[PDB]
Subunit: 306 residues, 4 copies
C-alpha cells in the first residue's frame, strides 16, 4: 500500500471564507468539493493505506487576524477530529496563523505537543510573507526543537506581471515559481543551517530546483556560504504533479533516494487524473522496483516512525 | 570551429544610457566592459569562427520614445559596422524599438532588407510589454513574411514580490521566470500557429520549459488548442548557461536535435567561466560526438545558410 | 437646465464582457443596471436638458485585441445610435481601442469625422498604459488636429500595495490616485505644450490636483519646464463626486471659472445620491449664482458650440 | 519661539546602511548631509527654541532582522544622547524595529520608560507592512497604555505602476499617497477606537485627507462604523511642506485648532526652502495671529507638558 503525503481537506469554515473573500475561483482554479468519505474512498480505490491531510492554498490570511486564528484553529480541530476518527487511515499536518509570529509559536507548541499533529504545513508566502522570513524566527525555533516535519505548499506569488499569461491558472506556473523563490529565500537566510533538525518537505518534486540549482550553485556558495547540493540531500520532496517523464528523473540526481515521498494532491487534482498519475509512477520504466517501493511507502514510513 | 548564437556587444550610447537611467548595477549584475577586440580575442582563444552579436538586456525602453529609437538605431549601426569590418567573424541581430509598433515595423524592414542583419533580437518584456503581445502584431507579420530569426533575450520580470530573494541578481532566477512566462504567453496568443515562418530561438536551453511543459500540456491543448510538444520541436534553443548536467539532457527529450545552438553569453558571463562552460560541452559524457558537432556548428550553419 | 458632462451608458456586449472577464464586482464596485430610459428619466427629474454619454471604467482592454476593437466599435455605435434617436437629449464621447495606437488613430478619425462623436473619452490607464504615454503620440496628433475634447476617466491603478486598505472599493481612493498620477504623467511628457488644441476634461474636480500642484510646482518648472498653474487654467474639470465643501472650493483658486463642468456620474453613483449631489451644488453658499449657472450650463454650452 | 515637530537627524550607521542597501538616491531624493550643529544653527537662525528629532524614511528594514534591530538601537541611542547633551534644544521620537512585533514591543517599553523618548515615530509602511496592520497589535497596546505620541512618516508606497510618472521623486506624490492609504487603513482596523489614548501626528497637513475624507465618509461610516470627521478632530497634524495657500486652509475645516503642529522637515527639505516655508506661515493672510501662535508653539507645548 501507499502513504500519501500531499492530500487535502476543506473545513466548512474554510470553504465559507473562500466564497466570502475571494471573487471567482481561488488561484484561477475552481474550489473542489470534499468530504472525508471522498478521501477514504479514493484511498480504497488506489491502495493507499495512510494519508497525511493538509490544508491547501490559498492560506487563511485575509487581513483579519482574529479570523485567521479562528480559521486555523477550526482547520486543525478538523484534522485532529479525523485523526481520532480514522487512526489508521488519516493523520494531519497543522496549519499556522502566519504572519502572526507569537500566535503561530503558540499553535506549533499546541498542535505538536497535545493535539496529535504529525507536523505542520506552511504557505510558501502568506499575502507577501515568504517562508524563511526572519519575521517568523521564533516559529522556526519551536519547530526545530521538536524536529518537526514542515511541508511547504505553494500559494499564488505575492505579485506578478499583469500583461502576460493572462488568466493562466496559478497552479500551472505560479505555484512553481513561488516554491522555487521560497526555497532560495530559505538558502539566503541559512534556514537549513540554523534549523538542521526540521524536516522540510518541498512539494511537486521540487518545482524548478532541478534546473536553477546548477545556475545558482556558485552565487549560493559565495554569497550565502551554502552548498545547494548538500541542502538538496538534506530536505525531502513529495512527487505530486506531472513528475514524469522529465521532472522526477532530474530530481533524483540531486535528492537523496530515501527522501522522496508519494503525493496525490486530491481533491484539487481531479481524482481520475490523480489515479492516472499514480498508475504512471507504478508502471514507468524510469523507476526501479526498489525506488517505486521507497517513494510509495518506505520513505514515508521511515519518516513517520522516527 | 564553433558558431556563437548568444554573444553580446555594448554600444557607447547604450552604456551611457544605463549609467544615466539605472541606479546601481543593471539587473543586480554589474555592467561588463567591452570592445570588439574582446569578443574577437575570445573567439580566437576558444575556436569560434563566427559570432552572431546581439544587444543584451535591459532593453533600451526608458520611457523616452525618441531616445529609444535613437539607441536602437545606434546599436544597429554598430552591429552593421562590425559586420562590414569583420565579414567572416561577426554578424548581428537587430534590436527593435519596442513597444512602439509602427516604428518597430520600420526597423524590421530596414534591418533585414538593407542593413545586413541576420535577424532580430527581442526582449521577453520591455517595461511590461511581453513578447507575444498583440500590441506588436504588425511587427510579427513583417518578421514572418521574411522567415526571420527571432532570438528572445530575458529581461528582469516586470514585477516581483519584494520580500523574497532580496538582492538575488536577476539573471540567476528572474531571467528564467521571464523567458518561461513569455514562452507561455506566445502559446496563449497562437504565435507559432499564426507566424509559422519565424524561427524563434529561446535562450538558456529553454529556461524552465523542460519542467513546466508536462504540467501545462493539458491546459494548453484544451484552452489554447496548441500541442506544446509540437511547438518544442518547432522552435530553436541556444545553450548558454549551466546547461549541464541536468538542463540540456532534459531539453533534448523535447527539442529537435537540429534546433540546438551553441552560445557563450560573453561578456556578461565572465570570459573564463564561459570558456569553462564551453569546455564542459566539449568533454561531457552526456553528449555524443554527433550532438556536440551539431550544437557547436552544424545547426547554426544550416540555419544561417537557409 | 443643466448639461451633464459625466454620465454613463453600458452596451450589452460591454456588460457581457465584464461578467466574462472580471471576477466579482469590477473595481470592487457592483456593475449598475442601465437602459437609455433610466438616463432620460433621470434627466427629466433633475432639470438636465443634455447629457454627453461616455463609457465608464474598466476600459475594454482584456488582453484580446480583436475583442477590444469589437467592444469599442459596439460602444461607439450605441453612442451614435442614441445621439440619432435623441438628438436633443443625448450626445456621446467615443471610446478608443487603446493601447493599439494605429487602430485608435483610425477610431478617432472615424468617430469625429463621420460618426458624430462630440469628442473622445479615455482611461487614465488601460492595463498599465497611462494616458500621456508616447506610445499613443499618433493618437494625440489626430486629436489635436481636430481640437478635440478628451475626457479622462479614472481606472483602477495598474498596481497597488497588497496589504493596505484591503477591500476598499477602487473608486473611493484608487480612482483619485490614478487621475492624479496621469495628470502629472501628462506634465512630464509636455502633453499640453505639444497638443495645445486638445481640450482635456479632468474628472472629479481634479482629484488630488488641488493639493499636489503646490508641492510639485517647483519640480515641474525646473525638470519639466512646465508651469503647473498655467496648465490648471488651460484644462477643464467636471465636478462629479463629493466636491463640496472642500474640493471644489480649492480647485477654483487654480481653475478658470469658464472651465468648470457639471457631472452626475450616473448610474455608477446611485441616482438618489447623484440627485442629492446636484441639489447641493444648487443650494450651497460656497458658490455665487453666476458660478452655479456657469458650472451647470454656460461652460458646457460654450464648449459645445465652439 | 517655535517648537519643531518634524525635523530629522541621520546616524552614521544609518547613512552607511543607505549607501550599502539602496542604489542611487533613496526615494529618488539625494540623502542630505547632517550633524547636530546644522540643526542647532538652523534653530537659532529661525527662532526655533525646541526640536523633536525623528528618523526619516526609508525605514531601516532591509531584510536583515539583526541589522534592523541594531540600526534602530543606534538611532535611539543617538536621539537619547542628543537630548542629554542639549536638554533645552533637542528631544527625540524613538524608531521601532518594525515589522518585528515582539521586538518593537520591547523598544517601546524601553524607549518610553527609561530612555527619555518623547514618543515614537513610525513608517506609514515598512517594506509592505502598513501601520495599522494587526501584525503590530501588541505594539499598539504598549503605546496606548502610555498615551504615547505616535508620529507617522511617509515612505515610498510598497508598489506602484511602473510606466507612469517615471523618475518622479517619491516625496512629491508617493509620500502623500502612502500617508493617505495608511490613514484609511487605520480607519479600517478601528485604530483610533481601540487605542484612543495614543496621540497620532499625521505629517504634511494630512496629505490628501483634506480631499478624500468627504468621498469616503459614507463608506467609512457604513462599513467601518467610523465617523471620519470625528477622527479628524481626534488626531494631530504637523504642517511641513507646501501647505499654503490651499492645503492647510482645507485641513482647518476638519482639524481641531489646538492639534496643528509646526514642522520644518530639515534637512531633507533644503534649509533655505524650509526657512522660506516658515516665513510664509508667519506672514500669510490665511491665518490669524492666534492660529500662527498655536501652530508655532502653543499646540506643541500643550502636548509636551501633558
Ligand atoms: Mn496541493
Ligand atoms: Mn545574454
Ligand atoms: Mn464616471
Ligand atoms: Mn520628513
Amino acid at each position: 500500500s501507499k502513504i500519501d503525503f500531499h492530500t487535502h481537506y476543506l473545513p466548512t469554515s474554510y470553504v465559507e471564507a473562500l466564497k466570502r473573500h475571494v471573487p471567482g475561483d481561488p488561484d484561477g482554479w475552481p474550489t473542489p468539493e470534499w468530504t472525508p468519505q471522498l478521501t477514504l474512498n479514493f484511498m480504497r480505490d488506489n491502495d493507499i493505506s495512510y494519508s497525511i491531510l493538509s490544508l491547501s492554498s490559498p492560506h487563511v490570511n485575509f487581513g483579519d487576524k482574529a479570523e485567521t486564528i479562528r480559521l486555523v484553529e477550526a482547520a486543525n480541530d478538523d484534522g485532529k477530529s479525523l485523526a481520532q476518527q480514522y487512526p489508521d487511515q488519516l493523520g494531519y499536518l497543522a496549519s499556522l496563523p502566519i504572519p502572526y509570529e507569537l500566535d503561530a509559536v503558540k499553535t506549533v507548541q499546541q498542535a505538536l505537543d497535545q493535539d496529535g499533529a504529525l507536523g505542520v504545513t506552511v504557505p510558501t508566502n502568506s499575502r507577501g510573507l515568504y517562508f524563511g522570513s526572519p519575521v517568523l524566527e521564533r516559529v522556526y525555533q519551536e519547530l526545530d526543537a521538536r524536529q518537526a516535519i514542515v511541508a511547504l505548499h505553494p500559494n499564488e506569488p505575492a505579485i506578478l506581471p499583469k500583461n502576460v499569461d493572462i488568466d493562466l491558472p496559478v497552479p500551472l506556473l505560479g505555484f512553481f515559481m513561488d516554491t522555487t523563490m521560497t526555497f532560495i529565500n530559505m538558502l539566503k537566510y541559512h534556514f537549513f543551517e540554523k534549523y538542521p533538525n526540521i524536516k522540510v518537505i518541498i512539494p511537486h518534486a521540487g518545482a524548478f530546483l532541478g534546473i536553477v540549482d546548477d545556475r545558482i550553485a556558485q552565487y549560493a556558495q559565495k554569497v550565502y556560504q551554502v552548498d545547494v547540493y548538500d541542502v538538496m540531500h538534506h530536505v525531502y520532496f513529495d512527487v505530486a504533479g506531472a513528475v514524469l517523464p522529465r521532472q522526477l528523473p532530474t530530481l533524483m540526481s540531486l535528492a537523496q533516494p530515501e527522501h522522496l515521498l508519494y503525493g496525490s494532491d486530491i481533491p484539487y487534482t481531479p481524482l481520475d487524473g490523480s489515479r492516472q498519475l499514480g498508475h504512471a509512477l507504478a508502471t514507468t520504466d524510469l523507476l526501479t522496483n526498489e525506488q517505486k517501493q521507497a517513494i510509495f511507502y518506505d520513505n514515508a514510513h521511515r519518516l513517520l516512525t522516527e
